Write an enzyme that holds these catalytic residues in place. Sequence first.
Site, short mmCIF file in Angstrom:
data_model
loop_
_atom_site.label_atom_id
_atom_site.label_comp_id
_atom_site.label_asym_id
_atom_site.label_seq_id
_atom_site.Cartn_x
_atom_site.Cartn_y
_atom_site.Cartn_z
N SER A 17 2.10 0.40 -6.37
CA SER A 17 1.73 1.20 -5.20
C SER A 17 2.60 2.38 -4.93
O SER A 17 2.17 3.46 -4.53
CB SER A 17 1.70 0.38 -3.93
N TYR A 29 1.80 5.93 -6.27
CA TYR A 29 0.85 6.59 -5.33
C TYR A 29 1.37 7.42 -4.17
O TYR A 29 0.63 8.11 -3.50
CB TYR A 29 -0.11 5.61 -4.66
N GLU A 70 -4.40 -6.10 -8.96
CA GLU A 70 -4.74 -5.51 -7.66
C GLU A 70 -5.72 -6.29 -6.85
O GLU A 70 -6.48 -7.09 -7.37
CB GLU A 70 -5.17 -4.06 -7.74
N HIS A 73 0.79 -1.24 0.00
CA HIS A 73 0.00 0.00 0.00
C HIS A 73 0.83 1.31 0.00
O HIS A 73 1.28 1.87 0.99
CB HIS A 73 -1.09 0.00 1.10
O1 FRQ Z 1 -1.13 1.12 -2.94
C1 FRQ Z 1 -2.11 1.65 -3.44
N1 FRQ Z 1 -2.55 2.78 -2.97
C2 FRQ Z 1 -3.49 3.49 -3.48
O2 FRQ Z 1 -3.71 4.56 -3.00
N2 FRQ Z 1 -4.15 3.05 -4.54
C3 FRQ Z 1 -5.05 3.98 -5.16
C4 FRQ Z 1 -6.46 3.78 -4.66
C5 FRQ Z 1 -6.75 4.39 -3.31
C6 FRQ Z 1 -8.26 4.57 -3.20
N3 FRQ Z 1 -8.66 5.09 -1.90
C7 FRQ Z 1 -9.86 4.57 -1.26
C8 FRQ Z 1 -10.55 5.70 -0.50
C9 FRQ Z 1 -9.59 6.37 0.45
C10 FRQ Z 1 -10.02 6.93 1.72
C11 FRQ Z 1 -9.30 7.98 2.27
C12 FRQ Z 1 -9.62 8.47 3.52
C13 FRQ Z 1 -10.70 7.95 4.21
C14 FRQ Z 1 -11.47 6.94 3.64
C15 FRQ Z 1 -11.11 6.41 2.41
C16 FRQ Z 1 -8.28 6.33 0.18
C17 FRQ Z 1 -7.64 5.72 -1.03
C18 FRQ Z 1 -3.90 1.83 -5.08
C19 FRQ Z 1 -4.62 1.31 -6.15
C20 FRQ Z 1 -4.25 0.10 -6.71
C21 FRQ Z 1 -3.16 -0.59 -6.19
C22 FRQ Z 1 -2.50 -0.07 -5.11
F1 FRQ Z 1 -1.53 -0.75 -4.56
C23 FRQ Z 1 -2.85 1.12 -4.56
#
Ligand code: FRQ
Length: 350
Positions: free
Chosen positions: A243, A246, A327, A201
């Site tokens: 990841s 990101y 993923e 992540h």
């Molecule tokens: O390592 C990874 N980190 C990531 O960030 N993403 C992008 C997708 C993140 C989507 N989000 C889901 C909703 C979020 C959130 C933020 C704060 C509070 C609640 C939810 C945060 C992040 C990834 C997507 C694919 C494969 C990955 F390895 C990652």
Amino acid sequence: KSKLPKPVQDLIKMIFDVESMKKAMVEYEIDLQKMPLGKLSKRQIQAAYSILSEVQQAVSQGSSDSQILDLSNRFYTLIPHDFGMKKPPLLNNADSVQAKVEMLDNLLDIEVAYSLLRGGSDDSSKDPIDVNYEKLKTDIKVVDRDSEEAEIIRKYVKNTHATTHNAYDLEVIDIFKIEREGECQRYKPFKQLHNRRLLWHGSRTTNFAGILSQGLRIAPPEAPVTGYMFGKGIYFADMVSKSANYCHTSQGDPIGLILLGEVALGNMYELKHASHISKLPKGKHSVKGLGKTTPDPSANISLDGVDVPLGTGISSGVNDTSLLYNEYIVYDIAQVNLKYLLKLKFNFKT
Ligand SMILES: O=c1[nH]c(=O)n(CCCCN2CC=C(c3ccccc3)CC2)c2cccc(F)c12
């Protein structure tokens, strides 16, 4: 100061770094001498998540053309952008709609960071690294480097540095082990689930003040299902680099924090294109987006009943797809527990 190991103290410092926080805010397009990072309200942050959604009943059901733009300036009223001047993306579009649902994701974790550094320290009779570290409600042991277990990590980073985004190259600086309070316990259900993994992540740094006090989370009760490739879970790669981009490490801040999480996958909904689920059907505990690069099955360590896919980037057979790497996604917060943190230099390229 804290008896805290110096990698830890320094790591506290970079994730509680206010300047940084505006840095990222500006990288979206925020207008901060309009809306400043004392004001960022969780209030406003979730009121505008809803505005992103109404714009997608709207845009996905044809709609009042004019209202699409009313919904758009509603949005902009609510989150000041230093636009500043170009021409702003008016939210008839699934593309800039998630462009913005990413921004809000970050303001969420940034408000958790910023609100966090106004609780305890006017001190002194405990000190400033010290107070921030306790408000993490997490314990951050420095993993000892020349030891076998730091080497498995680095072998992971190595083998899974991708086949395409090999420009930057990576390098490990610190290996933190992690325990947040209580999430051993909440995870216990999923403790013996079948099919269970170490995966990656990456997030911006400015998020991990909130990842440590709340763990990874599912998206708001208001966040577009349509804003995320696979709707409203929590996202993981096996490839280090899927990841690692990101974190948003430039040449002018090439240090990144990546997590390793243990994740209770079970039976994987296999999927090549996007899938706006709320809902995982019966018999299915996770999603797997299918990539054309898997880590090499010929190499698949399993320690403690968890698999660890430190395998060089091999072609899967899957060409038919929108993903290049796998993923994984899980729809219950307890279905994951955080194991490691990494401090990483992103060493760029020529
Ligand atoms: O390592 C990874 N980190 C990531 O960030 N993403 C992008 C997708 C993140 C989507 N989000 C889901 C909703 C979020 C959130 C933020 C704060 C509070 C609640 C939810 C945060 C992040 C990834 C997507 C694919 C494969 C990955 F390895 C990652």
